[PDB]
Design a protein around this ligand. Structure first.
Ligand SMILES: N=C(N)c1ccc(CNC(=O)[C@@H]2CCCN2C(=O)CNC2CCCC2)cc1
Ligand SMILES: [Ca+2]
Length: 223
């Protein structure tokens, strides 16, 4: 997260870290046994880490639970990142508490101009590399689809939306991948792609979660 701030410990209690010996992606807890992330975060041997603030220090509210299954969206295309969403099931139900909490799926999509919260353990530099070890936050509005499409002609689908700031300086970044965009109490976006981080006229691109709520609800009910 570039241009953001320290959230504070467990203030984003639906935020998860995906770990396979190291943090490699974010995710969102949507109920005691299931996580949503980006399909580009798929890999085998994932351990879900809940209740995290400093990801390099055991502070006392963590839950580490191995994934039992992963389900990438059936229409995921890795080249275009269309349908960049996956579901991960926990080997055992998480113990839900104030620091480990699920985030509601939308009932309908969010509008351009709605303010959201984006969070993650990703790079904080727009030039160069620096990884934070505590969770970083960023409040960012959803941008018009046309500004989105003008930034990335022919690369935006109906399953993507842009958020952030066209002037640059504030954006998500590598390592934030699969992490949440929460607007009005609902998970509306997943950190998916962009060009560089916090560059002028290159806003962040997010998976459009409202399009996938029926798929999510059907898939968890059958798995
Ligand atoms: N500036 C940002 N908001 C931002 C930029 C990049 C990321 C991380 N995501 C990525 O790097 C993703 C996953 C693997 C390939 N990838 C890409 O961005 C590759 N670029 C193409 C653009 C059209 C679809 C794929 C996360 C956030
Ligand atoms: Ca920790």
């Amino acid at each position: 997260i570039v241009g953001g701030y320290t959230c504070g410990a467990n203030t984003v209690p639906y935020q998860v870290s995906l770990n396979s010996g190291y943090h490699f992606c974010g995710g969102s807890l949507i109920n005691s046994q299931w996580v949503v992330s980006a399909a580009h975060c798929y890999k085998s041997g994932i351990q879900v880490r809940l209740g995290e603030d400093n990801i390099n220090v055991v502070e006392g509210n963590e839950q580490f639970i191995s994934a039992s299954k992963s389900i990438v969206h059936p229409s995921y295309n890795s080249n275009t990142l269309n349908n960049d969403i996956m579901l991960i099931k926990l080997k055992s139900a998480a113990s839900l508490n104030s620091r480990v909490a699920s985030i509601s799926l939308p009932t309908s999509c969010a509008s351009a101009g709605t303010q959201c919260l984006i969070s993650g353990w990703g790079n904080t530099k727009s030039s160069g590399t620096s990884y934070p070890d505590v969770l970083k936050c960023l409040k960012a509005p959803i941008l018009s689809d046309s500004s989105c499409k003008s930034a990335y002609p022919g690369q935006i689908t109906s399953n993507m939306f842009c958020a952030g700031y066209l002037e640059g300086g504030k954006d998500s970044c590598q390592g934030d991948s699969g992490g949440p965009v929460v607007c009005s109490g609902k998970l509306q976006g997943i950190v998916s792609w962009g060009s560089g981080c916090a560059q002028k006229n290159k806003p962040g691109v997010y998976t459009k979660v409202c399009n996938y709520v029926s798929w999510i609800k059907q898939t968890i009910a059958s798995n």
